[PDB]
Amino acid sequence: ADTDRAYLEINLNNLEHNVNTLQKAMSPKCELMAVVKAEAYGHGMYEVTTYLEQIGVSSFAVATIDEGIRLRKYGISSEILILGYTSPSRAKELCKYELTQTLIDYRYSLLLNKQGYDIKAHIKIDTGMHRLGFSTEDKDKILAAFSLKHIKVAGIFTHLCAADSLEENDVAFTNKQIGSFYKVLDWLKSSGLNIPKVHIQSSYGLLNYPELECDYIRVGVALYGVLSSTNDKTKLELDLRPVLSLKAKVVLIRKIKQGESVGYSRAFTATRDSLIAILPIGYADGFPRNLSSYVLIGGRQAPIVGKICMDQLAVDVTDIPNVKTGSIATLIGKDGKEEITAPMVAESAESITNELLSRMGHRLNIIRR
Amino acid sequence: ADTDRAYLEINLNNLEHNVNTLQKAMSPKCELMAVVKAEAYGHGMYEVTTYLEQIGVSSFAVATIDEGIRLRKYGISSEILILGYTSPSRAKELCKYELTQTLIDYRYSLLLNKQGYDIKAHIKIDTGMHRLGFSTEDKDKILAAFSLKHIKVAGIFTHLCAADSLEENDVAFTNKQIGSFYKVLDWLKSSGLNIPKVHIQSSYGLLNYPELECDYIRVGVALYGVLSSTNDKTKLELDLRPVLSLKAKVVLIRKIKQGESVGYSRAFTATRDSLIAILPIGYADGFPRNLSCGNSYVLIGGRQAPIVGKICMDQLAVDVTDIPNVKTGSIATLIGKDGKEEITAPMVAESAESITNELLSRMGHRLNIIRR
Ligand SMILES: [Cl-]
Ligand SMILES: [Cl-]
Ligand SMILES: [Cl-]
Ligand SMILES: [Cl-]
Numbered sequence: 149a150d151t152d153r154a155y156l157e158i159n160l161n162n163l164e165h166n167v168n169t170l171q172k173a174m175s176p177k178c179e180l181m182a183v184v185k186a187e188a189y190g191h192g193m194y195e196v197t198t199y200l201e202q203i204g205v206s207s208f209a210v211a212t213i214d215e216g217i218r219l220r221k222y223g224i225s226s227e228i229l230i231l232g233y234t235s236p237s238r239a240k241e242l243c244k245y246e247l248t249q250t251l252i253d254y255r256y257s258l259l260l261n262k263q264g265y266d267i268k269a270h271i272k273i274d275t276g277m278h279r280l281g282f283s284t285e286d287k288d289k290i291l292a293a294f295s296l297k298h299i300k301v302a303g304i305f306t307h308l309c310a311a312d313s314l315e316e317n318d319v320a321f322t323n324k325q326i327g328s329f330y331k332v333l334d335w336l337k338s339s340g341l342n343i344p345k346v347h348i349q350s351s352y353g354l355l356n357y358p359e360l361e362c363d364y365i366r367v368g369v370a371l372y373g374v375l376s377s378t379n380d381k382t383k384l385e386l387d388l389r390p391v392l393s394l395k396a397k398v399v400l401i402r403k404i405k406q407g408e409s410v411g412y413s414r415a416f417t418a419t420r421d422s423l424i425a426i427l428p429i430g431y432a433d434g435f436p437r438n439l440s441s442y443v444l445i446g447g448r449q450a451p452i453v454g455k456i457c458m459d460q461l462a463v464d465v466t467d468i469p470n471v472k473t474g475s476i477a478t479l480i481g482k483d484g485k486e487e488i489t490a491p492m493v494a495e496s497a498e499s500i501t502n503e504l505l506s507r508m509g510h511r512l513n514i515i516r517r
Numbered sequence: 518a519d520t521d522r523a524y525l526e527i528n529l530n531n532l533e534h535n536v537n538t539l540q541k542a543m544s545p546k547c548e549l550m551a552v553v554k555a556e557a558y559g560h561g562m563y564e565v566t567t568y569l570e571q572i573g574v575s576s577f578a579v580a581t582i583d584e585g586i587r588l589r590k591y592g593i594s595s596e597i598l599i600l601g602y603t604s605p606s607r608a609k610e611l612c613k614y615e616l617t618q619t620l621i622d623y624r625y626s627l628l629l630n631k632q633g634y635d636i637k638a639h640i641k642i643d644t645g646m647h648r649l650g651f652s653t654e655d656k657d658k659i660l661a662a663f664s665l666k667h668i669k670v671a672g673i674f675t676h677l678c679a680a681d682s683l684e685e686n687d688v689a690f691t692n693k694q695i696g697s698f699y700k701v702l703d704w705l706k707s708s709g710l711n712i713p714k715v716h717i718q719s720s721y722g723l724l725n726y727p728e729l730e731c732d733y734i735r736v737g738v739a740l741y742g743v744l745s746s747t748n749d750k751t752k753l754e755l756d757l758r759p760v761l762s763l764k765a766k767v768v769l770i771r772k773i774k775q776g777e778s779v780g781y782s783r784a785f786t787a788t789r790d791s792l793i794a795i796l797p798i799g800y801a802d803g804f805p806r807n808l809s810c811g812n813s814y815v816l817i818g819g820r821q822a823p824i825v826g827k828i829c830m831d832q833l834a835v836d837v838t839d840i841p842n843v844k845t846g847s848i849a850t851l852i853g854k855d856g857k858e859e860i861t862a863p864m865v866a867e868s869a870e871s872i873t874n875e876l877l878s879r880m881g882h883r884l885n886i887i888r889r
Contacts, residue, residue: 149606152604152606152607153581153602153604185801185830185831186801186830186831186881186883187882211801211830211831212522212797212831212883231831232768232797232831232832233768233769233795233797235521235522237518237521238518238521252768252769253769256769276781277779277780277781278771278773278777278778278779278780278793278834279769279771279779279780279795279829279832279834280768280769280795280832309780309781309782310781318781321781399601399602399621399649400602400621400622400625400648400649402622402643402647402652404647408647409647410646410647410648411646411647411648411678412645412646412678412679412687412690424647426602426648426649428581428601428602431874431875431878431879432554432555432580432875432878432879434879437871437872437875438870438871454647454648457648458554458555458580458874458875458878459554459555459580459581459600459601460601460648460649462647462648473624473625498807499806499807500806502800502830503800503801503806503830506800506801506830507800507801507803507879507881509879510556510882511555511581511583
């Protein structure tokens with residue numbers, strides 16, 4: 149029904165496994181804050197978060213207030229951190245929906261407080277990224293943010309720039325961020341302040357800097373069982389299992405003669421008489437065009453032929469037995485002994501895993517496995 | 518509220534201008550078939566299609582039955598053609614929602630007929646694209662499709678591979694596609710068949726093969742006032758105006774000391790003391806990550822602000838060192854006009870090493886859509 153054309157399959161057993169692996173890898177006092185922004189990295193925000201809350205995960209991060217509001221509507225009662233700027237004009241909603249707001253700088257905190265609504269917040273410290281956050285130099289402003297009447301600071305955090313790299317430049321830069329971050333905490337304590345919940349790590353924060361002990365780890369990619377690049381060399385090597393697979397049903401099969409093409413592409417000319425299968429998936433569904441690469445059918449590799457179109461693409465099934473309309477093609481996922489992983493696809497599309505997954509088309513039905 | 522973060526702005530006046538400009542280039546009896554698949558090429562299917570019907574467009578094409586059903590729920594009452602496969606198991610919905618189905622091949626046609634539901638259809642003929650459609654060889658299967666009890670064939674059509682190209686080889690292939698198509702029609706006629714409505718052209722079919730005489734033209738990119746690339750000299754040169762703008766409001770301004778980076782990516786090291794504006798739009802919103810590191814700029818206060826560092830999932834950074842009129846809340850134009858400056862969808866698509874169709878159809882679902 150949802151499985152007639154193209155669809156995403158999410159393996160909740162794999163997600164559940166990942167949650168447990170991640171939790172086990174963390175310090176006992178550290179909690180999993182599941183990053184579910186942009187439709188849970190394309191995995192489906194309702195599907196993922198309701199299930200996560202159901203198996204014990206009790207902390208979430210989203211990009212925007214509307215994301216966070218969606219979660220509340222879904223029934224999510226765990227705490228939720230909005231990672232981005234929310235306009236102060238929506239302070240009543242931060243209050244009503246009990247959404248935890250990131251304080252991006254002192255001015256913003258001031259304007260947010262001025263709105264007059266009691267709001268839970270985490271303060272972001274810019275430790276080198278130079279996007280959002282209070283600077284490590286402006287310690288009086290950071291401290292001042294703790295004495296705002298309507299702003300209940302429940303946490304303090306930063307974001308690492310190059311935790312996914314073991315290059316000495318990136319290591320020194322990562323340590324510099326970690327170091328200046330804890331110097332902020334030292335300074336605050338020196339001024340009598342009690343430190344709230346601390347978080348520093350994303351996925352590669354855990355993977356390459358497991359010696360860190362914070363109150364949460366913000367897990368995105370690792371939670372979904374994928375790596376950012378194919379075969380990375382992390383300190384930890386966790387048994388993470390891919391949650392997402394992408395499938396499409398063959399809708400038509402045709403013969404083309406030797407010397408013919410598909411879509412009249414300069415790139416493809418049949419070297420023999422060939423059998424072509426049509427799959428109802430294209431770039432509008434988030435399968436990248438510049439892969440104009442194979443799919444798996446019957447555990448076999450069927451090369452994509454011709455350019456990828458908006459709503460469909462073609463594959464060569466000449467060498468593959470028992471292919472008919474209704475046969476399931478695997479664009480991302482396992483098929484018997486063969487596997488096409490998300491990072492593999494991202495890589496050949498000259499992209500990273502995060503972009504490929506988070507840009508899965510809204511048109512794709514999502515179903516449980 | 519819908520303008521607080523990042524949003525698309527749809528110029529309905531420009532869209533209406535396009536509809537008129539396009540109809541003018543058409544034969545009087547030829548009807549505009551507005552192609553509104555993939556959220557109307559990212560423009561917002563609800564916004565665009567209701568307005569199109571309001572201004573008198575009476576024919577729509579979608580990619581899937583679920584798009585077609587959505588149109589019906591939006592109050593669309595005009596005919597709708599589903600261009601791609603629809604599971605025969607949903608023949609009841611095709612019937613109930615009065616959707617017209619593309620016959621993608623003979624076997625499909627038979628199977629849909631056997632469902633027992635009265636369904637309107639257009640038969641597709643493969644004339645060289647070699648994706649969907651009945652082959653030109655199998656003349657008898659085509660004629661047989663005109664004798665199915667529950668399928669009423671109301672049209673017959675094909676797609677041109679390269680109508681957008683005026684190169685020798687390409688023009689030749691297009692002409693043989695057209696020739697093959699009418700050969701089928703002649704053969705059908707000879708078999709005592711009265712031909713239904715015909716359509717062969719998409720946007721470039723109209724622009725580059727205007728001499729064709731059909732009952733519909735399926736207009737996609739032209740309707741949205743963008744041409745898939747820049748800048749082909751088409752046979753007709755129509756006055757088409759861009760419908761879509763992409764906008765985002767600055768959420769922070771940061772001083773960057775000379776020597777410092779943004780996001781530590783060696784992609785950017787300031788050569789001077791700089792001002793950086795942070796925009797709450799990223800690649801998850803459909804703004805392609807390969808636009809990173811100066812591969813595009815945005816418009817702020819009518820001036821160009823180059824993108825600095827890598828584009829993130831939900832945010833990016835631009836250089837406003839030379840634009841004093843930038844504050845929290847300032848509108849950045851990523852696609853569209855500002856002051857006397859313009860950054861068009863085709864320019865952005867070229868920068869992204871892509872094409873307009875892909876850039877636009879892949880606009881993120883998270884973006885708010887506002888009519889203008
Ligand atoms: Cl940030
Ligand atoms: Cl990290
Ligand atoms: Cl086709
Ligand atoms: Cl065309």
